Amino acid sequence: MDVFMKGLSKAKEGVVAAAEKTKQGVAEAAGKTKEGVLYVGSKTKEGVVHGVATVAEKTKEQVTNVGGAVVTGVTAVAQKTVEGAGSIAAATGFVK
Amino acid sequence: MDVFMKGLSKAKEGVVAAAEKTKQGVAEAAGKTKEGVLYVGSKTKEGVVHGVATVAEKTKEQVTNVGGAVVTGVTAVAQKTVEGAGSIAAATGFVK
Amino acid sequence: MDVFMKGLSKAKEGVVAAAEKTKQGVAEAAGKTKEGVLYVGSKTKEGVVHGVATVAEKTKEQVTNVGGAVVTGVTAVAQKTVEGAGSIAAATGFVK
Amino acid sequence: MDVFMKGLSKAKEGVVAAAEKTKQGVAEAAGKTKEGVLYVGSKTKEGVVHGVATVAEKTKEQVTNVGGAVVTGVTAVAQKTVEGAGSIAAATGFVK
Amino acid sequence: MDVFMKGLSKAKEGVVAAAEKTKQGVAEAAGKTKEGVLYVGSKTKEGVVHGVATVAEKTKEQVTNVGGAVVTGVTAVAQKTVEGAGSIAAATGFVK
Amino acid sequence: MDVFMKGLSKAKEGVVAAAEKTKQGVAEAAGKTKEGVLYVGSKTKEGVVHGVATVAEKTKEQVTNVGGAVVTGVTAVAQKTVEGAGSIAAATGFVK
């Protein structure tokens, strides 16, 4: 009995790394439990409406680089070691 | 019995790293439990409406670099070690 | 019985690192428990409306660098070690 | 040699009647005459851009009439007579 | 040699009647004459940009009439007579 | 040689009637004459930018009439007669 959007339950030694560049309209998390209930002579209505995110959106990204090195975007790195060596490189630029 | 958006439950030795550049309209977290209830002769209405995020949004990013190195964006790094060595590099620029 | 937006429950030795550049319309956290209740001859209405974030937003970022190194954005780093050495570098610029 | 948007030229005994409920983006009137001109070694650019009128427009008109007579809209009437009689009726409501 | 938006030229005995409920973004009137000109070694740029009128406009008109007569809108009437009789009625309501 | 927005030129016995309920962003009237000019080694830029009228405008008109007669809007009437009779009625309400 549990509901998650991005989580974890009943875990040992957890390592989590995350990153987002998102535009979410509705990220609603709902747990609806309905037990032991009676409806003699009744009208019931439940709803979730218009989960729109964006309209008429204009986005422009221009990158002009001459003899250089730039980093743009989203990056996530996670690493665990009991013993040893971990050599990890992401989005690196070496210029000579 | 629990609801999460981005969390964790019943965990030992947890390491979490996160980062966002988001534009969320509605991030509502709801737990609706309904037990032991009667509705003789009644009208019930429940709703969540218009979870819009943005309209008519204009975003522009211009990067002009000459002989350099710049860092833009979102980055998250998490690392755990019992014993040993961890060499991790992200979004690095070496120029000579 | 609990609801979280970004939190954690019943954990030992927790390390959390986070950072945001967000524009959230509604980040409401709601726990609605309804037990032992009667509605003979009644009208009930519950709602959450118009969770809009932004309209007509204009954002511009211009970066012009000549022979340099600048850092822009959101970065989060978390690291835990029992014994050993951790060498972590993020968004670094070396120029000679 | 002349340019008009809604006008008249070299006329005798003119009668004009007009009415609008318009939403025009660009109603620009341009007369561009280019004579006796030289362009040795040159770059020339001329332009008209983004003549947008409206975005994300919401318009609602509700008319609820019980046993009545209402007038809505745009009406234009023009009449000329040398001799005689002119009987003209527009958008009339007779109730008994 | 002349430019008009809504006018008249070289006319005798003119009668004009007009009425508007407009929302114009740009109603610019331009006369550009370019004669006897030289451009050795030059760059020329001419432009008109972003003639937008409206964004995110919300307009609502509700008319609720019971046993009556109302007049809404734009009306223009023009009439000329040398001799005689002119009977003109517009947007009239007779109730008995 | 002349530019008009709403006017008249070289006319005899003119009758004009007008009325507006407008919201104009830019109603600029420009006459640009360029003759006898030289541009050796030069850069020329001319422009008109951002003729926006309105953003995020909300307008509401509610008319509730019971057994009456009201007049709303814009009306313009013009009439000329050499000899005779002119009977003109606009937006009239007769109740008995």
Ligand SMILES: *[C@@H]1O[C@H](CO)[C@@H](O)[C@H](O)[C@H]1NC(C)=O
């Ligand atoms: C780890 O990675 C680095 C570069 O990030 C590399 O030079 C090295 O050899 C790797 N190994 C160890 C044991 O450091």
Ligand SMILES: *[C@@H]1O[C@H](CO)[C@@H](O)[C@H](O)[C@H]1NC(C)=O
């Ligand atoms: C760790 O990473 C660095 C660079 O970040 C590298 O020079 C080194 O060799 C790696 N290993 C150790 C044991 O330091």
Ligand SMILES: *[C@@H]1O[C@H](CO)[C@@H](O)[C@H](O)[C@H]1NC(C)=O
């Ligand atoms: C740790 O990282 C640094 C650079 O941040 C590196 O020079 C070094 O070798 C790494 N290891 C140790 C044990 O310091």
Ligand SMILES: *[C@@H]1O[C@H](CO)[C@@H](O)[C@H](O)[C@H]1NC(C)=O
């Ligand atoms: C003119 O029109 C009216 C109604 O508008 C009508 O009663 C009449 O007979 C018409 N003729 C004359 C000559 O008035």
Ligand SMILES: *[C@@H]1O[C@H](CO)[C@@H](O)[C@H](O)[C@H]1NC(C)=O
């Ligand atoms: C003119 O119009 C009126 C109503 O507006 C009408 O009663 C009349 O007969 C018409 N003619 C003359 C000559 O008045």
Ligand SMILES: *[C@@H]1O[C@H](CO)[C@@H](O)[C@H](O)[C@H]1NC(C)=O
């Ligand atoms: C003029 O119009 C009126 C009403 O406005 C009408 O009663 C009349 O008969 C018309 N004619 C003359 C000659 O007055």
